[PDB]
Amino acid sequence: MNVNEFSNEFDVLYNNIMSNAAPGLNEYEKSVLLTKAQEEIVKNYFEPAGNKYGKGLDDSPKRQIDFSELIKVGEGVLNTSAPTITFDKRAKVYDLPADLFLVINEAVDTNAGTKQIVPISYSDYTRLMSRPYKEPVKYQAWRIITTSINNISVELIVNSNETITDYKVRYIRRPAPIITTNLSSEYGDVTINGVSTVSECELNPIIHSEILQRAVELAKAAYQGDLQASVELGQRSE
Amino acid sequence: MNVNEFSNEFDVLYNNIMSNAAPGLNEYEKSVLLTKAQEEIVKNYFEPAGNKYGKGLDDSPKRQIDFSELIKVGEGVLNTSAPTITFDKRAKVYDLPADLFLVINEAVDTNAGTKQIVPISYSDYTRLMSRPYKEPVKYQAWRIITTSINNISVELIVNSNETITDYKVRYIRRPAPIITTNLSSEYGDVTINGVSTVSECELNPIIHSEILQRAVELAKAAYQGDLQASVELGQRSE
Amino acid sequence: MNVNEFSNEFDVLYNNIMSNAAPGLNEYEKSVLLTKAQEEIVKNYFEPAGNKYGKGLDDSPKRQIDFSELIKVGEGVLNTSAPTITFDKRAKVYDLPADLFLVINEAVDTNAGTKQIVPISYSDYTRLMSRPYKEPVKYQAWRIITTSINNISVELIVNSNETITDYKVRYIRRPAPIITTNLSSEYGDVTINGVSTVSECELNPIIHSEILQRAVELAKAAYQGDLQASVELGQRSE
Amino acid sequence: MNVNEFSNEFDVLYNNIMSNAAPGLNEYEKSVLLTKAQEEIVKNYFEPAGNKYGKGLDDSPKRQIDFSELIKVGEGVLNTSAPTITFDKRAKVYDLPADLFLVINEAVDTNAGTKQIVPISYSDYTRLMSRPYKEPVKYQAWRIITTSINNISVELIVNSNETITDYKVRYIRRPAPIITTNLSSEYGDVTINGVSTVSECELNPIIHSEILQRAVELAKAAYQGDLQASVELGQRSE
Amino acid sequence: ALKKEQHFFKGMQRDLSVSKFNPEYAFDAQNIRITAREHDTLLSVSNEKGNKEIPLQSPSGDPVVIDGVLLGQNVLNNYVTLFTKGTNDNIYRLENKGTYFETLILFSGNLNFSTDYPIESISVYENNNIQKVYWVDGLNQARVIN
Amino acid sequence: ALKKEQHFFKGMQRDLSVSKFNPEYAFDAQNIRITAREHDTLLSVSNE
Amino acid sequence: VEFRADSWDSDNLISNKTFDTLDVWNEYQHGTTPLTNLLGHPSPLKKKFRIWRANIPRAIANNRDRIRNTWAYIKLGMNTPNTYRTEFHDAIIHYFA
Amino acid sequence: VEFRADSWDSDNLISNKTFDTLDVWNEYQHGTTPLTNLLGHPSPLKKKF
C-alpha cells in the first residue's frame, strides 16, 4: 500500500478529517506515528518474546517474508585510517555499514578458509581468555565491539598466524521513514529521520496492515492522554 | 533522530498529538527528561532483570547494537603521583578514565603474559586471603577499589614476582546529554551535566524511540500524575 | 550533576517554584531530602535485600561504580592513650576512622604474617571460646566491639605469642551532605550534618538520578502528609 | 545529626515540608518521641524477627556499626554486702552495672581458667540438675537471675572446688535521651529518663535517619491517626 | 492534568474580590458585545463593529468644514442641529440623505457661547415650516431658531 | 488531621450563643472593611 | 486555556487567526505569550478538532515560572491590526489542584 | 489555622508580613503566639504556595 493508501486507511479507521478548516491529524503526525509503528513491529517480530506467538525472525515463513526486504549483505571496511587502540593484541578493527539495524550472520574469509563469526559476551571473553590456548575453535572467529565514532567498529579476534581478507555482514537494514507528503510545503523544517520528502515504505505488504493498526492504536492512546495507556503501549516499544 | 526531531515527536506523543491539551513543557525540561530517560534505558537494558525480556548487555543482537556506540577501550594510568596507602602489599594503584559508566572487560599485560582481571568481592577477598598461597590463578588477576578522589582508583593485585606494563579497560562510556536548544539564550544559567549548548544523542538510533517514550511517560507522571505514579515509575529508574 | 543541576532538576520534576514571593521548597529542605535520599540509596544498594534486584555491593559492576567514590582504606590507631578494660586477655584496642560508614575488609600485619580479620558474632565468640585451644585459625584473626566514646573501638583478638604491627581497614566513607547554597545567608544556624556551606555530592554520577528520584518521591510523600505513605517510604529507610 | 538538626528535619518530614499544615508539636513531645524511637529501633534491630531483613545484632556490618557505640565492657561486683538467700548452694551473687540494656557476652576468670558463661533457662536448670554430676562442662559456667533490688543480681553457678576472681560483662549500654532544648526553661518539671537538659544522641549517625523517620511515623499515628493506627504501629514497639 | 473549569460570559463585573469572583462574569473587557447584533451572537462574546465617515456635502455639492468645538446637538425629526464654537460661533442643519449629510449654515456670528456652558435643547414639530429648536446655556439668555 | 472548616466573613454578628454562631459572620472586629473601597475588596476583610 | 472561537471575513471562515496575545498575572506573577500557531513545530496556540487551546504563559521574571496560585487573572485579546468578527463562545481552564 | 491573605505597600507586594498575633481562648483556656516566620527554623507561622 503506497503512502496515500496508508493515510486514507488511517482516516477510515481513526476518523480524523482531511479538511484544513478543522485541523485534524497532520500528515507529519501520521508519518511520525507510522515510523514508530514500523520500528516497534520490527523490534517485536524480531525478538520472539516481543510478540504474542513466541516467534522471531526465522521461526515461521511469515516472519521471513516480513523481514525479507530489510535483509542486506555487505562487506566490512578496515578501520586502519584511524590508529586507535584495541583491547586485544590480534584485533583487526573493521567498520560496519551505516544503515545497520540488527546483525544476524557474520563470516570472515581468511587464508585458512571461511570461518563463521561468533558474537562473544563480555563474560565469555574473560572465561575463554583465562585458559591456556586463548584462541577460538578451528572453524569460528570472535567479535567484540570497540571504540565507535558515529559508526559501529568491531574487533575481529581471529586465531593468530592468519590474515583477514574479507568480512561479510548479513544484517537487517534500518527501515526508512513512512512519509505521506513533502513536509517542507506546509511545515518549515520538520523531519522524521533526516527526510523531508515522501518516503514510501520499504517493507513487504504483509506487515503494512500491522503497521497501520499499531499507528491507529498509538494515535488513540496519545489523544487519550492517559498515563496508564501510555505505559501499556510503551511496553511494546522494544 | 535529531534533537529537533526529539522535541517535535515528544510533543506529538506527549501534549496529545500536538493539541496543546496537556501541561506545556519547556525545552530545558524536555532536555532534562530525555537525559534521565537515556540513563534509565541504559541501566535497565544492561541489567537483565530491569527490562521485560530478561536480557542484559550481550544476550541478544539488539542489546549489542544498543550499547555499541558507548563501548570504549582505554588504558588505565598509574597513580604514582599520589603516595596514597593501599590495602594489599602488592597492589599497584591505577586511575581509570573519567568518562566511565560501567566496566565489562579488563586485562593487564605483564612480563609473564596477558591476564584477564577478575573483579573480586569484599567477601571473596577475605576467603581467598585466608589460604596458604594467597595469590591468583596462573591466568587471572584481582582488582579491588580503594581511595579515590573525584575519580576511580583501582588496586591491581597481580601475582608477586611480576610487573605490570599495561592496563586496558573496555568500559561503557558515560552518555552525553540530550539538549534541544542553547539554554543560555532564554535561561540564565542552567545545565544538564555541565553542558549548556545543543547536544545530539551519542547513541545508536535503535533506542532513540525508547528514550522518547520513556521521557513521555516521565513527563506524564511528573506533570499529570500523583505520588503513586511517581513512586511506581521510579521503580524503572535503576 | 553539580548541586545547581540537582536543584534545577528537582524543580523540573516536582514543580516547586524558585520565586521567594510564593515560598515553594527552600534550598535547606531540598538539601535535607537529598541527604536522606543518598543515605537511603547507600543503605539499600549495599544490602542486597534492600533493593529490587537482590544485589549488594560487589554483586554487579553497577553497584561497584556506585560505591567506588566512598571506598576508603585507612589504618587503625592504637587506643593505648586510655587505659580502659577489655573483655579478652589478649585484646589490643584500636581506634577506627571517624568518617566510618560500613566495614567490608580488615587485615592485620603481625610478625607471623598478614592475617585477614573475621568479624565474629557474640554467639560465635562463646562457641569458639568453650573449646580447648581458644585461638583463631592460622590465617585469620578475630575482632569484636568494645567500649567506645564518640568513636569506634575494636578489640583485636589475634593469636597469642604474636604482636600487631599494623591494622588496615577498607571501609565505605560516610557520604557528605548535598547542599545547594550557603544556608547561613537566609537561614540563621541550620545545618545538615554540621555543614552550612555548599557541599557538592561526593558520589558517582551513576546514582545521582536515583538520589534525585528518591528525593522527589520523599518530597511528594511529605507534602501529602498521609501516614500510609510515610510508613511505606520509611520501609526503605534501611 | 545534632539535636537542632533532629528537630528541624523532623519538622521537614512531619509538619509536611515545614508548611505548618499538621498538628503543631512541642520540643518536649519531639524529645519524647525521639527517645521512644531510638528504643524501638534498638529493640527491633537486635531481634532479627523485628526488622524487615531478618538480621539481628552481628548478622551484617550495618548492624555492627549501628550497635557499635552502645557496646560496653564492665566488671560485675560481688553482692556480699547483702546476706541474701540463693537458690543454688555454690552460687556467688554478683551485681551487674546499672546502665545495662542487653547482655551479649559474659565470662568468668577462675583459678582453673577463663570460662564462658552460658545463660541457662529455668527448664534447662531442672533438666541438668536431675543428673548424676550436676555441674557444668569443663569450659563453661552457668548463670541465673535471683533477687534483685532496683538493680540486676545474677547467681554465678560455677563448678565446685573453684573460686571466682573476675566477672566481665560485654553488654549494650542503655541509650541516653534525645532532648532538643532545656525543658526547665518553658516547662515546670518534665523529664525523659531523669534528664532535663539538652542530650545529644549517643549513637552512631547510621541509625539517626531511621530514628527520625520512626519518630515522624509515631507523631503521625498519635496526632493524625485513630485507634487502628496506634494498635498497628505498636507492633513495632518490641 | 487533574481538573477543569468552564467559564461563561454573561456580562462584566467589578468591585468584587478575586477570591469570590463568579465564573459567569468577566472582570474587564474592551470593545466587546455580549448581545446579538448583526448576527445571532447573544451571550457569546463578539467584536464591536467600527464606524464609517459620512461626508458633510452642501446642497451645491461642495464640502462643508465645521468651524470648531461642539457644545451640543438636537435631532428634531431628521434634521440634526449643531451648535459649535470656534473662530466664530456657528449653527448648522444636517439632514441625512442616502450617503451624505445635506449641511447648511443657519448662522455664523458672535452669539456669546462658552465651552464651560454647553447647550441643552428642546425641539418641536408644528408644521412643515415651523420647526423650532429652543436651547439654553447656563450663562446666556435662552434663544430660539427655526 | 481529620477534618476542616472554612470560615467566610460577610459582616459581624453578636448577641448569639457561641454554640450556635454561624461561620459566615465574625464575632468581633476592629478597624476592618468588608466592602470594596479604593480596591475590589468586597466580601474580603481589608484594612481601614 | 481551552476555548471555542471562530473568526470570519465577509462570510468566509478564517480558522488560522483567533487571538494574538494572552496576559496572565496574579499578585506575584505576570506572563505573556503571543499566541502563534506553527503547524509542525510546537507553539503556544494550537487547534485540533475545532477546539482552540493555549498554554498559560510563564512569568517573565523566571521563564521556568508556571502560573501557580489560588486565583489568577486571564486576559485574551487581539492587539494586531485586523478587520474580522471574532465570535468567542466559551473558555475552559484546565488546572492541577 | 489555614488562611489566604496578602499585604501590600504602594502597589508592591509584601509576602513576609500578614499578622502579628493570634489570641485563641474559650471558657477555660487562653493562649497566644506572636505569629513570626523563620525561614529555616520552625515558627508559629509559615507560608508555602
PDB file of N, CA, C and O in Angstrom, chain B residues 172-217:
ATOM      1  N   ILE B 172      31.809   1.042  29.310  1.00  0.00           N
ATOM      2  CA  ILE B 172      30.690   1.762  28.714  1.00  0.00           C
ATOM      3  C   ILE B 172      30.879   3.242  29.019  1.00  0.00           C
ATOM      4  O   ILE B 172      30.945   3.640  30.186  1.00  0.00           O
ATOM      5  N   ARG B 173      30.985   4.055  27.972  1.00  0.00           N
ATOM      6  CA  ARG B 173      31.218   5.479  28.156  1.00  0.00           C
ATOM      7  C   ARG B 173      29.972   6.158  28.716  1.00  0.00           C
ATOM      8  O   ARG B 173      28.839   5.757  28.438  1.00  0.00           O
ATOM      9  N   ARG B 174      30.193   7.193  29.517  1.00  0.00           N
ATOM     10  CA  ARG B 174      29.092   7.971  30.066  1.00  0.00           C
ATOM     11  C   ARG B 174      28.324   8.647  28.930  1.00  0.00           C
ATOM     12  O   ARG B 174      28.938   9.380  28.140  1.00  0.00           O
ATOM     13  N   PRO B 175      27.009   8.440  28.799  1.00  0.00           N
ATOM     14  CA  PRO B 175      26.285   9.099  27.704  1.00  0.00           C
ATOM     15  C   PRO B 175      26.279  10.611  27.860  1.00  0.00           C
ATOM     16  O   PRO B 175      26.252  11.148  28.971  1.00  0.00           O
ATOM     17  N   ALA B 176      26.305  11.298  26.722  1.00  0.00           N
ATOM     18  CA  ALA B 176      26.261  12.749  26.713  1.00  0.00           C
ATOM     19  C   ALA B 176      24.819  13.237  26.833  1.00  0.00           C
ATOM     20  O   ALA B 176      23.880  12.508  26.505  1.00  0.00           O
ATOM     21  N   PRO B 177      24.608  14.470  27.293  1.00  0.00           N
ATOM     22  CA  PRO B 177      23.235  14.955  27.472  1.00  0.00           C
ATOM     23  C   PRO B 177      22.523  15.151  26.143  1.00  0.00           C
ATOM     24  O   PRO B 177      23.139  15.268  25.081  1.00  0.00           O
ATOM     25  N   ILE B 178      21.195  15.180  26.222  1.00  0.00           N
ATOM     26  CA  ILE B 178      20.327  15.455  25.082  1.00  0.00           C
ATOM     27  C   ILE B 178      19.715  16.829  25.312  1.00  0.00           C
ATOM     28  O   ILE B 178      18.803  16.981  26.134  1.00  0.00           O
ATOM     29  N   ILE B 179      20.207  17.829  24.583  1.00  0.00           N
ATOM     30  CA  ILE B 179      19.769  19.214  24.718  1.00  0.00           C
ATOM     31  C   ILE B 179      19.235  19.676  23.369  1.00  0.00           C
ATOM     32  O   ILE B 179      19.892  19.485  22.338  1.00  0.00           O
ATOM     33  N   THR B 180      18.046  20.281  23.378  1.00  0.00           N
ATOM     34  CA  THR B 180      17.373  20.672  22.147  1.00  0.00           C
ATOM     35  C   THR B 180      17.719  22.083  21.688  1.00  0.00           C
ATOM     36  O   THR B 180      17.583  22.381  20.496  1.00  0.00           O
ATOM     37  N   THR B 181      18.188  22.945  22.585  1.00  0.00           N
ATOM     38  CA  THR B 181      18.461  24.328  22.221  1.00  0.00           C
ATOM     39  C   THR B 181      19.459  24.908  23.210  1.00  0.00           C
ATOM     40  O   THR B 181      19.626  24.401  24.322  1.00  0.00           O
ATOM     41  N   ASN B 182      20.124  25.979  22.781  1.00  0.00           N
ATOM     42  CA  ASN B 182      21.088  26.663  23.631  1.00  0.00           C
ATOM     43  C   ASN B 182      20.380  27.222  24.858  1.00  0.00           C
ATOM     44  O   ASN B 182      19.592  28.167  24.752  1.00  0.00           O
ATOM     45  N   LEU B 183      20.655  26.639  26.025  1.00  0.00           N
ATOM     46  CA  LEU B 183      19.944  27.029  27.237  1.00  0.00           C
ATOM     47  C   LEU B 183      20.357  28.407  27.737  1.00  0.00           C
ATOM     48  O   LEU B 183      19.613  29.017  28.512  1.00  0.00           O
ATOM     49  N   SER B 184      21.519  28.911  27.317  1.00  0.00           N
ATOM     50  CA  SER B 184      21.960  30.236  27.735  1.00  0.00           C
ATOM     51  C   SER B 184      21.179  31.361  27.065  1.00  0.00           C
ATOM     52  O   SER B 184      21.298  32.512  27.500  1.00  0.00           O
ATOM     53  N   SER B 185      20.392  31.067  26.029  1.00  0.00           N
ATOM     54  CA  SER B 185      19.653  32.119  25.338  1.00  0.00           C
ATOM     55  C   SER B 185      18.514  32.647  26.202  1.00  0.00           C
ATOM     56  O   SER B 185      18.477  33.835  26.546  1.00  0.00           O
ATOM     57  N   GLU B 186      17.573  31.774  26.567  1.00  0.00           N
ATOM     58  CA  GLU B 186      16.407  32.180  27.341  1.00  0.00           C
ATOM     59  C   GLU B 186      16.642  32.078  28.843  1.00  0.00           C
ATOM     60  O   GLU B 186      16.174  32.934  29.601  1.00  0.00           O
ATOM     61  N   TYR B 187      17.359  31.049  29.287  1.00  0.00           N
ATOM     62  CA  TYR B 187      17.549  30.773  30.704  1.00  0.00           C
ATOM     63  C   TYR B 187      18.918  31.270  31.148  1.00  0.00           C
ATOM     64  O   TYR B 187      19.899  31.166  30.407  1.00  0.00           O
ATOM     65  N   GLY B 188      18.974  31.815  32.361  1.00  0.00           N
ATOM     66  CA  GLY B 188      20.185  32.435  32.862  1.00  0.00           C
ATOM     67  C   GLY B 188      21.380  31.504  32.915  1.00  0.00           C
ATOM     68  O   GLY B 188      22.340  31.682  32.159  1.00  0.00           O
ATOM     69  N   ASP B 189      21.338  30.510  33.804  1.00  0.00           N
ATOM     70  CA  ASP B 189      22.441  29.555  33.942  1.00  0.00           C
ATOM     71  C   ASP B 189      21.845  28.224  34.406  1.00  0.00           C
ATOM     72  O   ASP B 189      21.629  28.007  35.601  1.00  0.00           O
ATOM     73  N   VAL B 190      21.581  27.343  33.444  1.00  0.00           N
ATOM     74  CA  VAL B 190      21.056  26.008  33.707  1.00  0.00           C
ATOM     75  C   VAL B 190      21.805  25.018  32.827  1.00  0.00           C
ATOM     76  O   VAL B 190      22.069  25.293  31.651  1.00  0.00           O
ATOM     77  N   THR B 191      22.152  23.869  33.403  1.00  0.00           N
ATOM     78  CA  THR B 191      22.896  22.832  32.701  1.00  0.00           C
ATOM     79  C   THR B 191      22.277  21.477  33.011  1.00  0.00           C
ATOM     80  O   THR B 191      21.500  21.327  33.957  1.00  0.00           O
ATOM     81  N   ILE B 192      22.629  20.490  32.193  1.00  0.00           N
ATOM     82  CA  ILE B 192      22.141  19.122  32.344  1.00  0.00           C
ATOM     83  C   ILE B 192      23.189  18.235  33.002  1.00  0.00           C
ATOM     84  O   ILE B 192      22.908  17.556  33.989  1.00  0.00           O
ATOM     85  N   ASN B 193      24.400  18.213  32.449  1.00  0.00           N
ATOM     86  CA  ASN B 193      25.548  17.549  33.057  1.00  0.00           C
ATOM     87  C   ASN B 193      26.789  18.413  32.891  1.00  0.00           C
ATOM     88  O   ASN B 193      27.883  17.915  32.608  1.00  0.00           O
ATOM     89  N   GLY B 194      26.632  19.722  33.064  1.00  0.00           N
ATOM     90  CA  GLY B 194      27.691  20.669  32.784  1.00  0.00           C
ATOM     91  C   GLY B 194      27.725  21.180  31.362  1.00  0.00           C
ATOM     92  O   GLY B 194      28.745  21.750  30.954  1.00  0.00           O
ATOM     93  N   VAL B 195      26.650  20.995  30.597  1.00  0.00           N
ATOM     94  CA  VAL B 195      26.565  21.420  29.205  1.00  0.00           C
ATOM     95  C   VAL B 195      25.389  22.377  29.064  1.00  0.00           C
ATOM     96  O   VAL B 195      24.323  22.152  29.649  1.00  0.00           O
ATOM     97  N   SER B 196      25.589  23.444  28.284  1.00  0.00           N
ATOM     98  CA  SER B 196      24.568  24.458  28.054  1.00  0.00           C
ATOM     99  C   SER B 196      24.123  24.575  26.604  1.00  0.00           C
ATOM    100  O   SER B 196      23.075  25.179  26.352  1.00  0.00           O
ATOM    101  N   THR B 197      24.872  24.021  25.652  1.00  0.00           N
ATOM    102  CA  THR B 197      24.565  24.138  24.237  1.00  0.00           C
ATOM    103  C   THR B 197      23.844  22.883  23.751  1.00  0.00           C
ATOM    104  O   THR B 197      23.577  21.950  24.511  1.00  0.00           O
ATOM    105  N   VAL B 198      23.520  22.868  22.457  1.00  0.00           N
ATOM    106  CA  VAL B 198      22.822  21.732  21.871  1.00  0.00           C
ATOM    107  C   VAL B 198      23.735  20.514  21.890  1.00  0.00           C
ATOM    108  O   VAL B 198      24.925  20.599  21.555  1.00  0.00           O
ATOM    109  N   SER B 199      23.178  19.369  22.286  1.00  0.00           N
ATOM    110  CA  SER B 199      23.925  18.120  22.409  1.00  0.00           C
ATOM    111  C   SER B 199      23.116  17.004  21.765  1.00  0.00           C
ATOM    112  O   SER B 199      22.081  16.594  22.299  1.00  0.00           O
ATOM    113  N   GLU B 200      23.586  16.517  20.620  1.00  0.00           N
ATOM    114  CA  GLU B 200      22.941  15.389  19.967  1.00  0.00           C
ATOM    115  C   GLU B 200      23.149  14.119  20.785  1.00  0.00           C
ATOM    116  O   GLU B 200      24.147  13.968  21.495  1.00  0.00           O
ATOM    117  N   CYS B 201      22.193  13.199  20.681  1.00  0.00           N
ATOM    118  CA  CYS B 201      22.303  11.934  21.396  1.00  0.00           C
ATOM    119  C   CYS B 201      23.465  11.120  20.843  1.00  0.00           C
ATOM    120  O   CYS B 201      23.541  10.867  19.636  1.00  0.00           O
ATOM    121  N   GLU B 202      24.372  10.712  21.727  1.00  0.00           N
ATOM    122  CA  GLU B 202      25.533   9.908  21.343  1.00  0.00           C
ATOM    123  C   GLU B 202      25.239   8.414  21.497  1.00  0.00           C
ATOM    124  O   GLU B 202      25.988   7.659  22.115  1.00  0.00           O
ATOM    125  N   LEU B 203      24.123   7.981  20.913  1.00  0.00           N
ATOM    126  CA  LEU B 203      23.679   6.595  20.979  1.00  0.00           C
ATOM    127  C   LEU B 203      23.215   6.156  19.598  1.00  0.00           C
ATOM    128  O   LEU B 203      23.000   6.973  18.699  1.00  0.00           O
ATOM    129  N   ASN B 204      23.059   4.846  19.440  1.00  0.00           N
ATOM    130  CA  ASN B 204      22.547   4.304  18.195  1.00  0.00           C
ATOM    131  C   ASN B 204      21.065   4.668  18.044  1.00  0.00           C
ATOM    132  O   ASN B 204      20.342   4.753  19.040  1.00  0.00           O
ATOM    133  N   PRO B 205      20.582   4.891  16.814  1.00  0.00           N
ATOM    134  CA  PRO B 205      19.147   5.183  16.637  1.00  0.00           C
ATOM    135  C   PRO B 205      18.192   4.087  17.105  1.00  0.00           C
ATOM    136  O   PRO B 205      16.977   4.323  17.085  1.00  0.00           O
ATOM    137  N   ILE B 206      18.681   2.911  17.505  1.00  0.00           N
ATOM    138  CA  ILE B 206      17.782   1.842  17.939  1.00  0.00           C
ATOM    139  C   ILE B 206      16.966   2.283  19.148  1.00  0.00           C
ATOM    140  O   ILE B 206      15.740   2.115  19.185  1.00  0.00           O
ATOM    141  N   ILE B 207      17.628   2.859  20.151  1.00  0.00           N
ATOM    142  CA  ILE B 207      16.982   3.129  21.435  1.00  0.00           C
ATOM    143  C   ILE B 207      16.466   4.561  21.509  1.00  0.00           C
ATOM    144  O   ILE B 207      16.019   5.006  22.570  1.00  0.00           O
ATOM    145  N   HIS B 208      16.514   5.297  20.396  1.00  0.00           N
ATOM    146  CA  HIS B 208      16.031   6.675  20.423  1.00  0.00           C
ATOM    147  C   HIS B 208      14.524   6.725  20.654  1.00  0.00           C
ATOM    148  O   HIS B 208      14.037   7.550  21.437  1.00  0.00           O
ATOM    149  N   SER B 209      13.769   5.845  19.991  1.00  0.00           N
ATOM    150  CA  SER B 209      12.327   5.798  20.213  1.00  0.00           C
ATOM    151  C   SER B 209      12.005   5.369  21.639  1.00  0.00           C
ATOM    152  O   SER B 209      11.062   5.884  22.254  1.00  0.00           O
ATOM    153  N   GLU B 210      12.771   4.417  22.179  1.00  0.00           N
ATOM    154  CA  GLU B 210      12.575   4.008  23.567  1.00  0.00           C
ATOM    155  C   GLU B 210      12.831   5.168  24.519  1.00  0.00           C
ATOM    156  O   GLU B 210      12.085   5.365  25.485  1.00  0.00           O
ATOM    157  N   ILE B 211      13.888   5.941  24.264  1.00  0.00           N
ATOM    158  CA  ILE B 211      14.185   7.105  25.092  1.00  0.00           C
ATOM    159  C   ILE B 211      13.046   8.111  25.008  1.00  0.00           C
ATOM    160  O   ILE B 211      12.631   8.687  26.020  1.00  0.00           O
ATOM    161  N   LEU B 212      12.531   8.342  23.800  1.00  0.00           N
ATOM    162  CA  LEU B 212      11.424   9.278  23.628  1.00  0.00           C
ATOM    163  C   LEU B 212      10.200   8.825  24.414  1.00  0.00           C
ATOM    164  O   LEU B 212       9.564   9.623  25.114  1.00  0.00           O
ATOM    165  N   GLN B 213       9.859   7.539  24.318  1.00  0.00           N
ATOM    166  CA  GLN B 213       8.688   7.031  25.027  1.00  0.00           C
ATOM    167  C   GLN B 213       8.878   7.105  26.537  1.00  0.00           C
ATOM    168  O   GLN B 213       7.946   7.462  27.270  1.00  0.00           O
ATOM    169  N   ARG B 214      10.074   6.764  27.026  1.00  0.00           N
ATOM    170  CA  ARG B 214      10.324   6.831  28.460  1.00  0.00           C
ATOM    171  C   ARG B 214      10.254   8.271  28.955  1.00  0.00           C
ATOM    172  O   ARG B 214       9.736   8.535  30.046  1.00  0.00           O
ATOM    173  N   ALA B 215      10.766   9.216  28.162  1.00  0.00           N
ATOM    174  CA  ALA B 215      10.646  10.623  28.523  1.00  0.00           C
ATOM    175  C   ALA B 215       9.187  11.058  28.547  1.00  0.00           C
ATOM    176  O   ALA B 215       8.780  11.844  29.410  1.00  0.00           O
ATOM    177  N   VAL B 216       8.383  10.564  27.601  1.00  0.00           N
ATOM    178  CA  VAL B 216       6.962  10.904  27.583  1.00  0.00           C
ATOM    179  C   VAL B 216       6.286  10.395  28.851  1.00  0.00           C
ATOM    180  O   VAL B 216       5.487  11.100  29.478  1.00  0.00           O
ATOM    181  N   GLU B 217       6.587   9.153  29.236  1.00  0.00           N
ATOM    182  CA  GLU B 217       5.996   8.596  30.452  1.00  0.00           C
ATOM    183  C   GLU B 217       6.445   9.365  31.688  1.00  0.00           C
ATOM    184  O   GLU B 217       5.643   9.618  32.596  1.00  0.00           O
TER     185      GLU B 217
END
